[PDB]
Amino acid sequence: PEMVRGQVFDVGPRYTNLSYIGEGAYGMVCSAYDNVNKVRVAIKKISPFEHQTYCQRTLREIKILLRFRHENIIGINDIIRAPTIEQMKDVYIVQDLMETDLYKLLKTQHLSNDHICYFLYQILRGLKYIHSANVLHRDLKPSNLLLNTTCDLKICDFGLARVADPDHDHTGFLTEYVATRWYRAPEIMLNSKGYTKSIDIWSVGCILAEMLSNRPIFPGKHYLDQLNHILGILGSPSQEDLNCIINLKARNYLLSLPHKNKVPWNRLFPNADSKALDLLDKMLTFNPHKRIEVEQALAHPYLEQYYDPSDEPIAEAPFKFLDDLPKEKLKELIFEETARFQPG
Ligand SMILES: O=C1NCc2ccc(-c3nc(NC4CCOCC4)ncc3Cl)cc21
Choosing from 139, 157, 200, 241, which is the catalytic residue? Predict the structure, then answer.
């Protein structure tokens, strides 16, 4: 088998001529040449079988991506794994190879307002489909938005995705959370498990802000510092917004803070389109109940040159309610879920 950086990367003979890209916390991503459909492709090595939570996230991701078909969402082209459960130590997911991601682009390139608009349109178009399937991405951030040489955009990394569960969203104050800190909505730190669609809208708002200045808008250094940053721009929550936080610890924390004034969006982003700032304001609304939804965002005047609901598809087959299964049963389900890609 092909070797890369002291790891077997066992994907031949269909897939040859490998180069390293990067690596997540339990597997490496490479590019490779696909000898059947004569193009280079991206391949992710996943090694989840020692741990139940890694099994759960691998299974969820595979199930979601195999169900989804959308121009603004990365698909699965192929899955490679051993012919038997016994021999199966790793799974490789083959996906379209993209040129770059929005994190890399923002570190190097000024975006014109027309690029911002197009990127934001595509993000929201992909997100409309995801949300229409009753799925939350839960880790939207620039590095999970892939781009090609003509600026087509695809959302990737459904490793933290979940089926939406708004009636079980409530939790206590300072409850630990998995998703990337700088893109976390204020309510995660206060009283939310991140099981409602509004969690994703907040992240998109953070992305839009970052496209406007090339800098993250709320770069907290740790859990409660993230809320310090959010409130330093939005200002103190209104009485009405506090009344929706019934949990006393969270409410009393907010009440304990000195008054903070809102920083006007046009002072933070003096070169921005006024319509982009109006949409930004509605995405970065403190109260998740008042936060704009994806379909409203699409219909916003900023996006009027692209908006076309007949060309913003929804999912044919949304998901419903698989968390007490042990890792051995989860291996059998991953083996079952990947069986369509085998020879035979
Ligand atoms: O799902 C994921 N999590 C971690 C990751 C890394 C990379 C990819 C990925 N990258 C690329 N192209 C790179 C090329 C160099 O510039 C950055 C983008 N193309 C397809 C995929 Cl599927 C997907 C994931």
Answer: 139
Task: Name the experiment that determined this structure.
Answer: X-ray
Q: How far is the CA of 97 from the centre of ligand 1 (A)?
A: 7
Fold designation for 1-97+326-343: Phosphorylase Kinase; domain 1 (3.30.200)
For the CA atoms of the chain, what is the radius of gyration? Answer: 21
Strands ordered across the beta sheet of 15-24: 15-24, 27-34, 39-46, 91-96, 78-80
Is 96 in the active site? no
Q: Which residue has the tokens 């300072």?
A: 174
Beta-bridge partners for 22: 29
Q: What is the CATH number of domain 98-325?
A: 1.10.510.10
Residue ranges lining ligand 1, Cβ < 6 Å: 21-22, 24, 29, 42, 44, 74, 95, 97-98, 100-101, 104, 146, 156-157
CB atoms inside a 10 Å sphere around CB 213: 15
Q: How far is C-alpha 66 from the chain's CA centre?
A: 17
Q: Which residues pair with 20 in a beta bridge?
A: 30
Residue 64 is labelled as binding a ligand: no
Both tokens of 14, joined, read 């269909």
Domain parsing of the chain, residue ranges: 1-97+326-343, 98-325
Token readout for 107 is 């570190």
6 annotated as belonging to a binding site for a ligand:
no
Q: Is 22 annotated as a binding residue?
A: yes
Q: How far apart are CA 135 and CA 249, in angstroms?
A: 30
Q: What is the residue with the minimal CA distance to atom 12 of ligand 1? A: 98
